[PDB]
Amino acid sequence: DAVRDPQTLEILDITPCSFGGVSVITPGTNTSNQVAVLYQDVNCTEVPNVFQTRAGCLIGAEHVNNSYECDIPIGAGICASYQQSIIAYTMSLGAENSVAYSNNSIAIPTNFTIS
Amino acid sequence: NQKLIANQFNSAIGKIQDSLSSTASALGKLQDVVNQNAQALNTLVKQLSSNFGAISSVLNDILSRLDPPEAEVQIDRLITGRLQSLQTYVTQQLIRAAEIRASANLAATKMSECVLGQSKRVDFCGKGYHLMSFPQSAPHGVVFLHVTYVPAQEKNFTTAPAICHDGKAHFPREGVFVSNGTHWFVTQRNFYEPQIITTDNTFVSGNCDVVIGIVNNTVYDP
Amino acid sequence: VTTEILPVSMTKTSVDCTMYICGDSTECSNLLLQYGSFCTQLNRALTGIAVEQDKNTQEVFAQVKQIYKTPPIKDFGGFNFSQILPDPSKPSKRSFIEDLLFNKVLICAQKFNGLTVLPPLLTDEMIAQYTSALLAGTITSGWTFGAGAALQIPFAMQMAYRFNGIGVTQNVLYENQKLIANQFNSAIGKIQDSLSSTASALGKLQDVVNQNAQALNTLVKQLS
Amino acid sequence: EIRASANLAATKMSECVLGQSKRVDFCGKGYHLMSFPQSAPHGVVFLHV
Numbered sequence: 001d002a003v004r005d006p007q008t009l010e011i012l013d014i015t016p017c018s019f020g021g022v023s024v025i026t027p028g029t030n031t032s033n034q035v036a037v038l039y040q041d042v043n044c045t046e047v048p049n050v051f052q053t054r055a056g057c058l059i060g061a062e063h064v065n066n067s068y069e070c071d072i073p074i075g076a077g078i079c080a081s082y083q084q085s086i087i088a089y090t091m092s093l094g095a096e097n098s099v100a101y102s103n104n105s106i107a108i109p110t111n112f113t114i115s
Numbered sequence: 116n117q118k119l120i121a122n123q124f125n126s127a128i129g130k131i132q133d134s135l136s137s138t139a140s141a142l143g144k145l146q147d148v149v150n151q152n153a154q155a156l157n158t159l160v161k162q163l164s165s166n167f168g169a170i171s172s173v174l175n176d177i178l179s180r181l182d183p184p185e186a187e188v189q190i191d192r193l194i195t196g197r198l199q200s201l202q203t204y205v206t207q208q209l210i211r212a213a214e215i216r217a218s219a220n221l222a223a224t225k226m227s228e229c230v231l232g233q234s235k236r237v238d239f240c241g242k243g244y245h246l247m248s249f250p251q252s253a254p255h256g257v258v259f260l261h262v263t264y265v266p267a268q269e270k271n272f273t274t275a276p277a278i279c280h281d282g283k284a285h286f287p288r289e290g291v292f293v294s295n296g297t298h299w300f301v302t303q304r305n306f307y308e309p310q311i312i313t314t315d316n317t318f319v320s321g322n323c324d325v326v327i328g329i330v331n332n333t334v335y336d337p
Numbered sequence: 338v339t340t341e342i343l344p345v346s347m348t349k350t351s352v353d354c355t356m357y358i359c360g361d362s363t364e365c366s367n368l369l370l371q372y373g374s375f376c377t378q379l380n381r382a383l384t385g386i387a388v389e390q391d392k393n394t395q396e397v398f399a400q401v402k403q404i405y406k407t408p409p410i411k412d413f414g415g416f417n418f419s420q421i422l423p424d425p426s427k428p429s430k431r432s433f434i435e436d437l438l439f440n441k442v443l444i445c446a447q448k449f450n451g452l453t454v455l456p457p458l459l460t461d462e463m464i465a466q467y468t469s470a471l472l473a474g475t476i477t478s479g480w481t482f483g484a485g486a487a488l489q490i491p492f493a494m495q496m497a498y499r500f501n502g503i504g505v506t507q508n509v510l511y512e513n514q515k516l517i518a519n520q521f522n523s524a525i526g527k528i529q530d531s532l533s534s535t536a537s538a539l540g541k542l543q544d545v546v547n548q549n550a551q552a553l554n555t556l557v558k559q560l561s
Numbered sequence: 562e563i564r565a566s567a568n569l570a571a572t573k574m575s576e577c578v579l580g581q582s583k584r585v586d587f588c589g590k591g592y593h594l595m596s597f598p599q600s601a602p603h604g605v606v607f608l609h610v
């Protein structure tokens with residue numbers, strides 16, 4: 001991981017050239033032939049709608065501020081879906097619900113369903 | 116509600132019928148098992164086309180060209196590779212079989228506890244309060260139709276842990292105390308059904324100076 | 338209060354078979370093709386594991402449909418939850434106890450051989466949100482949130498149901514409500530101190546980490 | 562092994578957190594009242610009351 005140069009006695013560090021897996025994000029071909037590509041654990045400055053995330057550099061997916069239920073997982077909280085074009089978003093964990101708690105209030109079902 | 120319950124049940128069964136007829140992916144858990152084993156066999160068979168360093172993947176071709184002193188060397192390369200490929204297959208099947216065994220044990224447990232009984236284990240026999248279940252046969256598997264009771268329409272009520280009648284603290288025997296804003300009733304917890312509070316549906320223990328949140332009301336004694 | 342610790346997931350490693358065996362070598366890579374699909378099925382086996390680890394996490398924590406929240410006024414009949422509920426003063430909305438667990442429980446050298454690590458689908462912040470929702474539900478609706486819509490119920494009444502469940506009448510709770518709240522609050526404090534003090538308390542999770550670290554170090558050293 | 566542990570953890574979440582268990586020594590030692598999940602590195606911690 002390091003070498004002393006033979007002409008000038010300089011110490012150099014050696015790192016591998018950037019590499020990583022390449023994953024293709026796609027809706028099925030029944031819907032679209034449009035794809036997005038994830039360069040896993042790679043910087044967006046090393047690879048050559050470019051979104052840098054923890055999982056890697058995601059290219060071809062439009063990043064939006066709207067969360068949705070998870071469709072195609074990317075990793076690190078990011079999912080992608082086809083909605084048309086491919087988009088990337090932080091997945092929602094579900095709708096929020098503040099429970100109307102008080103020391104003297106009880107909810108009681110008045111009906112039921114059979115599921 | 117017997118007529119309603121029968122209708123809700125019959126409707127829910129019809130929904131299963133349509134869901135299964137429509138959604139191809141519904142049985143993905145069983146199809147995945149089939150696919151994993153199919154891939155394992157296709158991989159095993161395709162390995163027979165590998166040379167593994169030999170002059171040929173075909174044993175007959177090695178033997179048609181070479182005499183034993185040379186053929187054995189080429190054959191040893193195929194044996195090593197084919198034996199290794201077969202060992203890999205078997206190991207994967209033993210691990211995969213263990214997963215299926217665990218699933219089968221779970222299925223057997225559900226059969227006993229969900230079909231041959233009524234479970235009090237939450238989310239074990241479906242999502243909701245388990246009533247009953249019905250097994251159905253499936254390719255290399257079992258499908259359970261879990262019938263559950265689920266609370267529906269909503270209403271808020273005022274409550275209290277106890278009622279102060281004669282200075283004594285009255286607690287509900289089976290349900291909870293509720294109020295509609297003017298009158299107090301006792302009702303079963305999972306279904307609103309208010310009843311007049313009487314000495315027959317409450318019990319008495321201690322006095323009103325200990326219970327936090329106790330309210331004043333009348334307990335009737337027919 | 339008893340602490341039970343269980344592994345849920347494993348680090349999602351990914352090993353590139355060709356890179357590992359024949360890193361940056363065309364001559365080696367071609368020889369490796371004589372072994373057929375061995376690399377394809379090894380890459381597949383590890384991929385299957387990685388997928389499973391996200392599934393394991395999802396099945397344990399995503400059991401709640403909605404993200405429930407507690408009210409601004411935490412009046413739970415004398416029962417204190419500040420140790421197990423989130424404290425938003427910091428970027429990660431974890432509880433005090435969770436911070437202790439997290440604080441208690443090389444990668445370049447490994448990575449350089451085609452050994453990458455994939456991030457979990459659910460980040461620590463999302464796991465914390467799920468546990469907060471499960472906890473908020475447990476506290477404000479008891480078990481009803483697990484069988485449908487969450488009912489609201491006073492915490493003391495919820496406890497009364499739980500006492501009935503164990504064969505103890507309701508008045509025992511109410512008559513001793515102050516004592517019970519104190520015993521509970523004290524027991525929680527004991528957990529806080531036990532975790533702060535005993536390093537080995539989370540050995541079950543650390544052991545999983547250690548086994549996987551050894552497996553990778555062994556794999557990498559074999560290249561020598 | 563991890564899958565088995567995760568399945569156990571998922572079972573406990575449902576039966577110990579989203580309910581009250583009558584299974585002895587399943588949700589702690591004693592008569593189970595309730596439990597609270599806590600997040601942990603690659604795992605879950607249950608506080609069983």
Ligand SMILES: *[C@@H]1O[C@H](CO)[C@@H](O[C@@H]2O[C@H](CO)[C@@H](O)[C@H](O)[C@H]2NC(C)=O)[C@H](O)[C@H]1NC(C)=O
Binds near residue numbers: 267
């Ligand atoms: C409880 O809910 C059920 C539906 O799940 C109600 O039944 C429906 O009532 C409407 C009229 O408002 C009818 O048009 C539907 O056809 C009924 N459905 C079924 C399956 O019968 C029922 O009336 C509700 N009960 C109470 C007391 O509110």
Ligand SMILES: *[C@@H]1O[C@H](CO)[C@@H](O[C@@H]2O[C@H](CO)[C@@H](O)[C@H](O)[C@H]2NC(C)=O)[C@H](O)[C@H]1NC(C)=O
Binds near residue numbers: 295296297298
């Ligand atoms: C609380 O419930 C009681 C009992 O049903 C209600 O009192 C009745 O009100 C009806 C009119 O809707 C009268 O015809 C009955 O004679 C009343 N019964 C009694 C015993 O007084 C009461 O109105 C409800 N309160 C609220 C706020 O809804």
Ligand SMILES: *[C@@H]1O[C@H](CO)[C@@H](O[C@@H]2O[C@H](CO)[C@@H](O)[C@H](O)[C@H]2NC(C)=O)[C@H](O)[C@H]1NC(C)=O
Binds near residue numbers: 279329
């Ligand atoms: C419930 O009713 C009792 C009386 O039956 C109330 O008792 C009074 O409490 C006040 C405050 O300490 C005293 O000044 C009165 O002298 C008490 N009255 C009697 C007859 O002893 C009690 O406060 C009521 N509780 C609620 C919540 O309304």
Ligand SMILES: *[C@@H]1O[C@H](CO)[C@@H](O[C@@H]2O[C@H](CO)[C@@H](O)[C@H](O)[C@H]2NC(C)=O)[C@H](O)[C@H]1NC(C)=O
Binds near residue numbers: 418420
């Ligand atoms: C709930 O418990 C927390 C501690 O877990 C209480 O906060 C502490 O209060 C004491 C004073 O009595 C301070 O010295 C500590 O530094 C506080 N600790 C923290 C983390 O803030 C809190 O007051 C209790 N809540 C209620 C309603 O009693």
Ligand SMILES: *[C@@H]1O[C@H](CO)[C@@H](O[C@@H]2O[C@H](CO)[C@@H](O)[C@H](O)[C@H]2NC(C)=O)[C@H](O)[C@H]1NC(C)=O
Binds near residue numbers: 516519520
């Ligand atoms: C039941 O046991 C509890 C302790 O677990 C008793 O509470 C303690 O009482 C002593 C006095 O003898 C106090 O000094 C302690 O501070 C109390 N501890 C707590 C947590 O409150 C309680 O008195 C006993 N009850 C009965 C009926 O014997």
Ligand SMILES: *[C@@H]1O[C@H](CO)[C@@H](O)[C@H](O)[C@H]1NC(C)=O
Binds near residue numbers: 006007008
């Ligand atoms: C040749 O190598 C020696 C190493 O001691 C170094 O001092 C010298 O400067 C080098 N000469 C050139 C032209 O690089």
Ligand SMILES: *[C@@H]1O[C@H](CO)[C@@H](O)[C@H](O)[C@H]1NC(C)=O
Binds near residue numbers: 030031
């Ligand atoms: C897939 O394409 C076929 C046409 O070849 C169509 O009939 C079917 O409904 C499509 N399914 C989906 C989910 O798009």
Ligand SMILES: *[C@@H]1O[C@H](CO)[C@@H](O)[C@H](O)[C@H]1NC(C)=O
Binds near residue numbers: 042043044
């Ligand atoms: C990519 O490089 C930039 C510098 O141009 C740096 O600031 C950023 O943090 C790097 N991102 C990753 C994932 O390495």
Ligand SMILES: *[C@@H]1O[C@H](CO)[C@@H](O)[C@H](O)[C@H]1NC(C)=O
Binds near residue numbers: 063064065
């Ligand atoms: C999300 O909103 C912020 C402003 O709060 C903005 O700066 C950011 O660019 C937006 N991101 C996307 C993907 O729209």
Ligand SMILES: *[C@@H]1O[C@H](CO)[C@@H](O)[C@H](O)[C@H]1NC(C)=O
Binds near residue numbers: 100
């Ligand atoms: C109960 O009251 C709260 C307000 O505190 C309200 O938001 C909620 O919708 C009410 N629920 C029902 C069933 O009325």
Ligand SMILES: *[C@@H]1O[C@H](CO)[C@@H](O)[C@H](O)[C@H]1NC(C)=O
Binds near residue numbers: 103104327328329412
């Ligand atoms: C119930 O909560 C209210 C605040 O919302 C408080 O004023 C009241 O005293 C509490 N009741 C009891 C019995 O503690």
